[PDB]
């Protein structure tokens, strides 16, 4: 019978507890997905060119030249934490778990309905129409995670959602010689077409099977099993000066009050220890050989060009710069009843304190005559190339064999969960955009489309666009995301940083009288982990 | 920084043994996993390969 409902909603976050303190967090998630018919009948190349908006000199960073194929298909990506955990679940996870393993994942579509509209308007069912569904089980297609544009499924369970129209990058050749306001003329700023040798026109129809669901069937993905290294829900505080055995106090203070300070008694050059100051005797906390380097300075706001055009060189971590900034809309955490097109924004000021503070760095000459003269120092205030606004720290890079770093923290709700590793022989050690890097063939992107429901007028020999019966579909999406996590232990006397509702946000998470609701951003790595 | 504060007592972190002038304490033998060390040095700079 066509009328039999063929799937059950489920959004309950299970928590099963195993031996030796591991817990299987397991988020079911469900949403209603609304798919409109594709306006573009067929696959479509486009080149975007905001020539005027970047031709005015000194506006290099506004460049948006790219070439992309836009398709009749749409993507139902669930790769973001807000799709799976509510604020309470996230609170329990961050406030109790320490280590976290991404285990397995699966999706299904059920209870699809399809409708055809007509002239005031009328809405009619069409039991013969079909949703098209395809899952890229071998990751043939371009991997296009919707998180980085904030185009994943809506985070609210009860609100409907729409899948993003799918597109992918074609190849292009482009150059843009930078400039500044007051440059004497137009720089070279041109689009060299596309190189023949590297075009890749993928199509969903050719690469992967398509199932037709015809208004009464289910699609079900198999359980994919991940292989990622675990993420840590705890941060490190020990910067480089705080590694190793501290000096010994000769004279502790003898009265209470914050103004009092303890004294190292030994003179500057009479201390004992090991330094890399191979020619100079002053052992100091700044000069003593710590075991290795934590964090690294990287050239901040550095832009580099391939032949596909300029891009910002990424940074791993930092104290203004470095910290990521997320811009997101109605379905992705804004107060839903707020009018206007402007997105809401935050910068995630992480506790991942392995960053750098460029205003404090300096160089000085090898002789190290200690009360150093101006000619033997390079400070952050000194110009490079006569440009007063650019200092040595802008161009500096202390990445080295000795450097050590942590993974990027999770960020809730807008953060990405997983990401596929680059398919190169030498692979990047970390991914800036998600914590859990894949190693092998991580979940097949699920593409959906409505089958063309054409009228009697059709004639494919005519070049005009084909006349669709204007149609749309609703279907219920459901998936299961399995983790395994280790609960925290109280190694330290002091309490660790709680996450908690409080007087300054008690009216934040609760819904409003007008029915609007919001998800605010939340920290992830709360408790401190001893690095050394 | 309160986010970073840690405070360890030995007393609430490790078991303690009280020896009272007649006993002895011995560890178990820890076994290492270290990579080897080479007691030899490489003289070839980049100029001297090939």
- Give the class of chain A from helix and strand content and strand pairing: mainly beta
Helix content of chain A: under 10%
Q: Using CB atoms under 8 Å apart, which protein chain pair has the greatest interface?
A: A-B, 12 and 11 residues
Name given to the CATH homologous superfamily of chain A: Parvovirus coat protein VP1/VP2
**CATH top-level class of chain A:** Mainly Beta
- What is the level-2 CATH architecture name of chain A? Beta Complex
Number of strands of chain A: 28
Q: What is the C-alpha radius of gyration of chain A, as a whole number of Å? A: 28 Å
Say what oligomer this is: part of a larger assembly
Tell me the distance between the termini of chain A.
Answer: 65 Å
Anisotropy-based shape of chain A: globular
- Structural domain tally of chain A: 1
Helix tally of chain A equals 4
GO cellular component, one term (chain A): T=1 icosahedral viral capsid
GO biological process, one term (chain A): microtubule-dependent intracellular transport of viral material towards nucleus
Subcellular location (chain A): Virion; Host nucleus
Protein name (chain A): Capsid protein VP1
């Amino acid at each position: 019978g066509v009328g039999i409902s063929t799937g059950t909603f489920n959004n309950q976050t299970e928590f099963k507890f195993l031996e030796n303190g591991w817990v299987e967090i397991t988020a079911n998630s469900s949403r209603l997905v609304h798919l409109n018919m594709p306006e573009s009948e067929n696959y479509r190349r486009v080149v975007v060119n905001n020539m005027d908006k970047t031709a005015v000199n000194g506006n290099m960073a506004l460049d948006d030249i790219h070439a992309q194929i836009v398709t009749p298909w749409s993507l139902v990506d669930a790769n973001a934490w807000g799709v799976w955990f509510n604020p309470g679940d996230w609170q329990l996870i961050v406030n109790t778990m320490s280590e976290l393993h991404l285990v397995s994942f699966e999706q299904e579509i059920f209870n699809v309905v399809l409708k055809t509209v007509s002239e005031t308007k009328v809405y009619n069912n069409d039991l013969t129409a079909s949703l098209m569904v395809a899952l890229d089980s071998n990751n043939t297609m371009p991997f296009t995670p919707a998180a980085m544009r904030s185009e994943t499924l809506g985070f609210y369970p009860w609100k409907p959602t729409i899948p993003t129209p799918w597109r992918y990058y074609f190849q292009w050749d482009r150059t843009l010689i930078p400039s500044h306001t007051g440059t004497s003329g137009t720089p070279t700023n041109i689009y060299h077409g596309t190189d023949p040798d590297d075009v890749q026109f993928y199509t969903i129809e050719n690469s992967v099977p398509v199932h037709l669901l015809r208004t009464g069937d289910e699609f079900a993905t198999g359980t994919f099993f991940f292989d990622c290294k675990p993420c840590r829900l705890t941060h490190t505080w020990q910067t480089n000066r705080a590694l190793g055995l501290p000096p010994f106090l000769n004279s502790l203070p003898q009265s209470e009050g914050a103004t009092n300070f303890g004294d190292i008694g030994v003179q500057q050059d009479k201390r004992r220890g090991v330094t890399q100051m191979g020619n100079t005797n002053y052992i100091t906390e700044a000069t003593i050989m710590r075991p290795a380097e934590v964090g690294y300075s990287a050239p901040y706001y550095s832009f580099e060009a391939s032949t596909q055009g300029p891009f910002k060189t990424p940074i791993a971590a930092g104290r203004a710069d470095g910290n990521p900034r997320y811009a997101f809309g109605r379905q992705h955490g804004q107060k839903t009843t707020t009018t206007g097109e402007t997105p809401e924004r935050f910068t995630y000021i992480a506790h991942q304190d392995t960053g750098r503070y460029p205003e404090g760095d300096w160089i000085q000459n090898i002789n190290f005559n200690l009360p150093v003269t101006n000619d033997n120092v390079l400070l952050p205030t000194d110009p490079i190339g006569g440009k007063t606004g650019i200092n040595y720290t802008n161009i500096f890079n202390t990445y080295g064999p000795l450097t050590a770093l942590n993974n990027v923290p999770p960020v809730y709700p807008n953060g990405q969960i997983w990401d596929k590793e680059f398919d190169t022989d030498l692979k990047p050690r970390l991914h800036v955009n998600a914590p859990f890097v894949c190693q092998n063939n991580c979940p097949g992107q699920l593409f959906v489309k409505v089958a063309p429901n054409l009228t009697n007028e059709y004639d494919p020999d005519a070049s005009a666009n084909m006349s669709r019966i204007v149609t749309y579909s609703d279907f219920w999406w459901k998936g299961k995301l399995v983790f395994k996590a280790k609960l925290r232990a109280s190694h330290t006397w002091n309490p660790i940083q709680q996450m908690s509702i409080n007087v300054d946000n008690q009216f934040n998470y609760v819904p409003s009288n007008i029915g609007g609701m919001k998800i605010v951003y939340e920290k992830s790595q709360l408790a401190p982990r001893k690095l050394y």
